[PDB]
From a paper:
NoV VP1 can be divided into two major domains: the N-terminal shell (S) domain and the C-terminal protruding (P) domain. The P domains form the outermost, dimeric protrusions of NoV virions, which plays critical roles in receptor recognition and host immune responses. HuNoVs recognize human histo-blood group antigens (HBGAs) as host receptors or attachment factors that play an important role in huNoV host susceptibility. In this study, we provided both phenotypic and structural evidence to show that huNoV DSV and [name] recognize a group of glycans with terminal galactoses as ligands.
The crystal structure of native [name] P protein was determined at 2.18 Å resolution, containing four [name] P protein protomers or two homodimers in the crystallographic asymmetric unit. Most residues of [name] P protein were modeled except residues S409–A415 (in B chain), due to uninterpretable local electron density maps caused by the local disorder of this highly flexible loop region. The two P proteins exhibited the typical huNoV P dimer arch-like structure with the P1 subdomains situated at the bottom and the P2 subdomain situated at the top. The major structural differences compared with other known P proteins are at the surface exposed loops, including the previously identified A-, B-, P-, T-, and U-loops in the P2 subdomain and the S-loop in the P1 subdomain. These variable loops confer DSV and [name] unique surface topology from other huNoVs. We noted that the P-loop and T-loop on the surface of DSV/[name] P protein exhibit a higher extension and the distance between the two loops becomes closer. Therefore, the glycan binding pocket becomes narrower but deeper, which hinders the binding to HBGAs. No complex was formed by soaking native [name] P protein crystals with NA2 N-Glycan, probably due to crystal packing.
Residue numbers in the entry:
A (entry chain A): 231 to 533
B (entry chain B): 230 to 408, 413 to 533
């Protein structure tokens, strides 16, 4: 039988950055379409895009240092050291999907070391030599690292694109992973609001962002622990949408009804002009009620 | 309601002490006699213990407000969500690192929106006299130019030998002195019957590590989350598990998972036990067994 985790939201992780869920929101300016590559899963537990099983794989890069044509970077592998297969995903599993910004990362050797001198503060820019789908990304801070040094890079913070094309970091934008004719076809597909007054629910987490469009806020379509739960359970999808209640376990009140679609995103009907689920407490738990049709009309949520 | 473990291959799961993928399983002659890790601590019926979080995203992070005191700067600690740290809950805030006797090199950033990376600080947390997480205070180098009462989240980057020189290596089997401290997860012992504790090993950036980059934990983080989610009553002295081969789906070895959240096997004479098993296998619950249930040896 289908289920969602019986765990309070505020103890769960964002599925795009390894940070606790701070709030829920709907978006008028950004909620018309998203194509996040992390936090992408079916309700029957098929991982999509670059989505990992574990939050510990999120926003990490692994590869071997190259020096070519006056530029330094990584020949990418998977985080476990196994080869990156370009037909399988648009980048290695857990590769960050924060588009059009600088990635300030800490890179360390994948072999035992004696001193912190082998630890490098690197900057990954999304410019001409950013080609994760082809298995190569440029990086500043690698000039003094020997060719073929195997390393793991962990995302610390992001800042506006070094080239000046965007004055802020927009956490709604995904990377351009490659430049081929069939490039958009290799991605986890776009997510649209489905109709019937429904808006996509975004789970917001704080991440270290210099000059963020929404300050520290990063949106995702499902908590990481929900991803893991679906992969674990492999529950057959038996309807067009899973009706959920958001319960307050402390007050024993039903706070709102929600719809979770086979494509792994959640909707609510925001009350009139409204912030919808943004005013709800963040320590509630989702519970599966039943399978419903796509046209099942939800009770409005919020003020 | 019925007891289960995740149907997830080990190599996709996280260490419960450091946010890194599981690389191997092992037993330990030198360190397997007693461990008291404070992270990765959970009952099979889903009670979190020590500083153990629900989410891997909470692991090895500290949150607090900068204070400046004569010759020493540090954090007044809170929980990672900004809510107050209660000593009646845990021996330190949830997700507090449990790598004892070593320097913590951490990246600290403001919890309020900022414009540039000049507010990002590289800090060093030493485990000396002013390291008092149970009292809700730690000292840190690298905070002299941060305004008092700046709220910050610090994330563990790497660890190195203690600044005071009392140890030449980082020993990942040693926990901090938190205090005495209320809510220390209790010691774990091998229970007899030829059984050795199974450690799930992950690499973390460690300068001069006793075992290089390798950090042991007693259970994968996703197992912790699964037990908290399921809240299955414990109906026996131990849960018999099979470790299944990924290609044949067949039994490679039997394990006992105890109510206290740790797992054991009987290593073959040779002695590497589960270390030679493939790391992309899955554990499956078989049945509840008695404490004296004698396991078939595992390994070469």
């Amino acid at each position: 039988p289908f289920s969602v985790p019986n765990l309070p939201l505020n103890t769960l992780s964002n599925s795009r950055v390894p940070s606790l869920i701070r709030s829920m929101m709907v978006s008028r300016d950004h909620g018309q379409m998203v194509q996040f590559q992390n936090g992408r899963v079916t309700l029957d537990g098929q991982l999509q895009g670059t989505t990992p099983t574990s939050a510990s794989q999120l926003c990490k890069i692994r590869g071997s240092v190259f020096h070519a044509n006056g530029g330094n970077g990584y020949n990418l592998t998977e985080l476990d050291g196994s080869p990156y297969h370009a037909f399988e995903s648009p980048a290695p599993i857990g590769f960050p999907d924060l588009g059009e910004c600088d990635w300030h990362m800490e890179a360390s050797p994948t072999t035992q070391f004696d001193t912190g001198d082998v630890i490098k503060q690197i900057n990954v820019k999304q410019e001409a030599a950013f080609a994760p789908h082809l298995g190569t990304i440029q990086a500043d801070g690698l000039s003094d690292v020997s060719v073929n040094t195997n390393m793991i890079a962990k995302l610390g913070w992001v800042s506006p694109a070094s080239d000046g094309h965007r004055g802020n970091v927009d956490p709604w934008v995904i990377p351009r992973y490659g430049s081929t004719l069939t490039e958009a076809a290799q991605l986890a597909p776009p997510i649209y609001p489905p109709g019937f007054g429904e808006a996509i629910v975004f789970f917001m987490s704080d991440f270290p962002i210099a000059h963020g469009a929404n300050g520290l806020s990063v949106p995702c379509t499902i908590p990481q622990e929900f991803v893991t739960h679906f992969v674990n359970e492999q529950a057959p999808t038996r309807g067009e949408a899973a009706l959920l209640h958001y319960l307050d376990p402390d007050t024993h009140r039903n706070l709102g009804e929600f719809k979770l679609y086979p494509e792994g995103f959640m909707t609510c009907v925001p009350n009139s002009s409204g912030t919808g689920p943004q005013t709800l407490p963040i320590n509630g738990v989702f519970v599966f009620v039943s399978w419903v049709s796509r046209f099942y009309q939800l009770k409005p949520v919020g003020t």
